[PDB]
Amino acid sequence: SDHETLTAILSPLIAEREAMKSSELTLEMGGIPRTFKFIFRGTGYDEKLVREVEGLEASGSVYICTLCDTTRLEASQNLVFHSITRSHAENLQRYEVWRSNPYHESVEELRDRVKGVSAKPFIETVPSIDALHCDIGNAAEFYKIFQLEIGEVYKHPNASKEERKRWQATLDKHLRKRMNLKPIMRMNG
Amino acid sequence: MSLQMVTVGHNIALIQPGFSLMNFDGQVFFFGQKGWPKRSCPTGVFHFDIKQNHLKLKPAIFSKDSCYLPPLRYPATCSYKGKHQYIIHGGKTPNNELSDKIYIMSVACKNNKKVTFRCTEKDLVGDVPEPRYGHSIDVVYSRGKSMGVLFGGRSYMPSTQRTTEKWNSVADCLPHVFLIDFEFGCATSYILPELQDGLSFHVSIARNDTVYILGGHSLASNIRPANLYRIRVDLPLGTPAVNCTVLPGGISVSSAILTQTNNDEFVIVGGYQLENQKRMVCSLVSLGDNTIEISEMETPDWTSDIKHSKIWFGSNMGNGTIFLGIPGDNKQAMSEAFYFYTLRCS
Amino acid sequence: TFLSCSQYHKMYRTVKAITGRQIFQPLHALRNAEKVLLPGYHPFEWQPPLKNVSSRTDVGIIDGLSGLASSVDEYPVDTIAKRFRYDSALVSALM
Ligand SMILES: [Zn+2]
């Protein structure tokens, strides 16, 4: 999260990475020398980092998908009909539109136009989904829905935020009584 | 001379070394946060309002038509007092690119202490200077007109000798002088033959026809020269002319802080003497009609945390008032990494 | 097995003391077989060559700051970082 030192260190590496995307490589491989080309796919960043270096805002935004461009509120109405529509150079030119402010729009309407981007893209990536944190987040969400559904709040909503801690206690105790589980919070794989 | 300590706001993280304090209409303002502008305030410029040594960094929205500017971290700033406005050129983005464009800070409307700023992106034509930081701009008048003097500072290697093992290395700009028209943003360089060696983090004063430069940090020999130079520009209706003269009775200081303590009367607070010696004793300068006099100022009090620290930074709040910041304490571990102080000059 | 050098030396000397043979190798003989396995050993040629890239093929550890000048007048830095170059580790992984 200390953005300064991270930029100032990693920028030689991204310089070299951009450099060797347009060449051949030649070296002796056991007898005859051979040649090489390259294609890179920066993928193994988690979710928070790729929200932090490609140029999006923090995690709690309204624009949520790092691939499509939809509001969080939009995903509640329409569920599954988008497509990937976020390149790297598109985020570069959108950053340019943000810094220039050509149409003299508001802060808010321009943020509505650029679809979230408010920093210079620092590095390239390919867009995709990390598997590990997908699994972990789904497990945490299902833990949440069980801690809800024991409290039977589908009939009556908005109880206190203490009985839910009680339901948390009884869920851990009962599942240790039926599956013999040690209690932890950092949800390991 | 009156020091005082000062309490801290909750979002203290936005203060870093290399900031900028602009002073609009008796009303201070902060610029140059650390890290990109967060979603809580997308501009990056903040109300630096201070009351009873407690500051409350309120945000600041822009106009409807400004150009949203990234936090430049070591810009050149000056007071174009001709409808007050400020000038920003150079600086250093958080991705350690270096822009060279100019940004002009102005006001649109002030209604009950809620202000609207207005800043404009200004492009240059002609011999554009290399994008650099640590340098110094200043404005000057002559014969009913005004122009911008710009004295160079440190920058990256050019696009040939920049190598991926020495990528972040830095060398001085070639010590030339740039003159800039802001009616159209015209540029002109001039090769002055008296100033030879590079210089950065110097201190610049402008008195309406003439520009005075002292201090500064050479890199090539890595020393701080003990001199000062007077620059006379002139604006006839023909070509503008450049002229310089060294003047004796200077000091060696590096990255200090100036302030207008009185009408044609200024004070230089301490900086660094040697590469480990922070300069403690401050100075004052009487800037006369065609004379210039530096002098020993009355040695203001320090706390032990100041005189046993190792680095400070700060800037000029505007009215005999400077704001000063040091990092935290390693042997006194409980800290939010920074502590602050304020010096008045009454 | 993540064993340090000194205990490896002790293992070496007692094995040679017990069996008379020499099955493990000594440590200088270890490093002079190690240096074939880092980055920066083997010649190669970038074609068409790379701008901003030093063309020497004898690059191992350099500092990560790229010689970022760091004194009391500049921005204060506090971090340590070591790295290779990209092509060096890439050809070493290829070989
Ligand atoms: Zn989507």
The closest CB to that of B254, out of C52, C73, C75, belongs to: C73
Give CA angle at B239 (B233, B241), nearest 5°: 25
**SS3 label, residue C26:** coil
The closest CB to that of C50, out of A4, A20, A29, belongs to: A20
Sign of CA dihedral B131, B133, B138, B139: positive
**SS3 label, residue B82:** coil
Any B CB within 8 A of C53 CB = yes
Sheet of B102-111, strand order: B75-80, B85-90, B102-111, B114-122
Contact call for residues B137 and B77 (beta carbons, < 8 A)? yes
Tokens of B161: 């000798």
Residues B226, B63: Cα–Cα separation, whole Å: 45
**SS3 label, residue B119:** strand
Residues B124, B148: Cα–Cα separation, whole Å: 12
- Beta-carbon neighbour count of residue B172 at 10 Å? 20
Q: How many residues belong to chain C? A: 95
Any A CB within 8 A of B68 CB = yes
Chains that touch A (3 or more CB pairs under 8 A): B, C
What letter represents residue B11's amino acid? N
The minimum CA-CA distance between C2 and chain A, rounded to whole Å, is 26
Nearest Cα residue in chain B from A100 = B67
- b/e map A85-108, b = 16+ CB within 10 Å: ebeeeebeebbeebbebeeeeeee
Residue B219 falls in which region: left (phi positive, over 0), alpha (psi -120 to 50) or beta: alpha
Peptide bond preceding B70 in cis form (omega within 30 of 0) = no
Nearest Cα residue in chain A from C48 = A23
Give the phi and the psi of residue A164 in degrees, each rounded to 5: -70, -35
**SS3 label, residue B330:** coil
Q: How far is the CA of A66 from the centre of ligand 1 (A)?
A: 7
Q: Which helix (H) or strand (E) holds C6?
A: helix C5-19
Helices A3-19 and C86-94 pack at an angle, to 10 degrees, of 60
Helix/strand/coil (H/E/C) assignment for every residue in chain A? CCHHHHHHHHHHHHHHHHHCCCCEEEEECCCCEEEECCCCCCCCCCCCCHHHHCCCCCCCCCECCCCCCCEHHHHHHCCCCCCCCCCCHHHHHHHHHHHHCCCCCCHHHHHHHHCCCCCCCCCCCCCCCCHHHHHHHHHHHHHHHHHHHCCCCCCCCCCCCCHHHHHHHHHHHHHHHHCCCCCCCCCCC
To the question of whether residue A112 is assigned a binding role by annotation, the answer is no
List all residues 6 or more positions away from C19 whose beta carbon is below 8 Å from its beta carbon. Answer: none
Helices A163-178 and A131-149 pack at an angle, to 10 degrees, of 110
Q: DSSP secondary-structure letter at C65?
A: T
C78–A4 CB contact, under 8 Å: no
Contact call for residues B311 and B327 (beta carbons, < 8 A)? yes
Contact call for residues B138 and B78 (beta carbons, < 8 A)? yes
Sign of CA dihedral A168, A173, A179, A181: positive
Sign of CA dihedral A130, A135, A139, A141: positive
Q: Which helix (H) or strand (E) holds B286?
A: strand B283-286
List all residues 6 or more positions away from B225 whose beta carbon is below 8 Å from its beta carbon. Answer: B197, B199, B216, B218, B250, B252
List all residues 6 or more positions away from B71 whose beta carbon is below 8 Å from its beta carbon. Answer: B31, B32, B33, B34, B36, B37, B44, B93, B94
Nearest Cα residue in chain A from C83 = A13
Sheet of B257-262, strand order: B257-262, B265-269, B283-286, B293-296
Residues C94, A27: Cα–Cα separation, whole Å: 10
Sign of CA dihedral A152, A157, A163, A168: positive
Q: How far is the CA of A136 from the centre of ligand 1 (A)?
A: 20
Q: How far is the CA of A70 from the centre of ligand 1 (A)?
A: 6
Q: How far is the CA of A115 from the centre of ligand 1 (A)?
A: 12
Q: How far is the CA of A80 from the centre of ligand 1 (A)?
A: 9
Residues B31, B72: Cα–Cα separation, whole Å: 8
Any B CB within 8 A of A113 CB = no
What letter represents residue B226's amino acid? A
Contact call for residues C94 and A35 (beta carbons, < 8 A)? no
Nearest Cα residue in chain A from C81 = A9
Tokens of C64: 């990560």
What residues of A are in contact with residue B163 (Cβ under 8 Å)?
Answer: none
Residues B265, A2: Cα–Cα separation, whole Å: 41
Q: DSSP secondary-structure letter at B17?
A: S
State the burial class of residue B344 (Cβ atoms within 10 Å of its Cβ: 0-12, 13-18, 19+). Answer: middle
Residues B312, A30: Cα–Cα separation, whole Å: 58
Tokens of A136: 């972990």
What residues of B are in contact with residue A61 (Cβ under 8 Å)?
Answer: 39
What residues of A are in contact with residue C94 (Cβ under 8 Å)?
Answer: 27, 29, 36
Residues B11, A4: Cα–Cα separation, whole Å: 18
Number of H helices, E strands in chain C: 3, 3
The minimum CA-CA distance between B168 and chain C, rounded to whole Å, is 5
Any C CB within 8 A of B220 CB = no
What residues of A are in contact with residue C79 (Cβ under 8 Å)?
Answer: 5, 9
- Beta-carbon neighbour count of residue B118 at 10 Å? 17
The minimum CA-CA distance between B72 and chain A, rounded to whole Å, is 12
Residues B303, B280: Cα–Cα separation, whole Å: 12
Number of H helices, E strands in chain B: 1, 27
CA A56 to chain centre: 9
What residues of B are in contact with residue C71 (Cβ under 8 Å)?
Answer: 275
- Looking at the DSSP bridge assignments, the partners of residue B257 are B269
Tokens of B110: 């002030």
- b/e map B101-114, b = 16+ CB within 10 Å: bbbbbbbeeeeeee
The minimum CA-CA distance between A53 and chain B, rounded to whole Å, is 10
Contact call for residues B31 and B41 (beta carbons, < 8 A)? no
What residues of C are in contact with residue B201 (Cβ under 8 Å)?
Answer: 73
Which of B337, B308, B341, B324 has its CA nearest to residue B259?
B324
Contact call for residues B315 and B21 (beta carbons, < 8 A)? yes
CA B135 to chain centre: 8
List all residues 6 or more positions away from A109 whose beta carbon is below 8 Å from its beta carbon. Answer: none
The maximal CA–CA distance of chain B, rounded, in angstroms, is: 63
Q: How far is the CA of A94 from the centre of ligand 1 (A)?
A: 18
Size of interface B-C (CB pairs under 8 A): 49
Q: Which helix (H) or strand (E) holds B285?
A: strand B283-286
Residues C67, C51: Cα–Cα separation, whole Å: 19
What letter represents residue A71's amino acid? T
- Beta-carbon neighbour count of residue B30 at 10 Å? 22
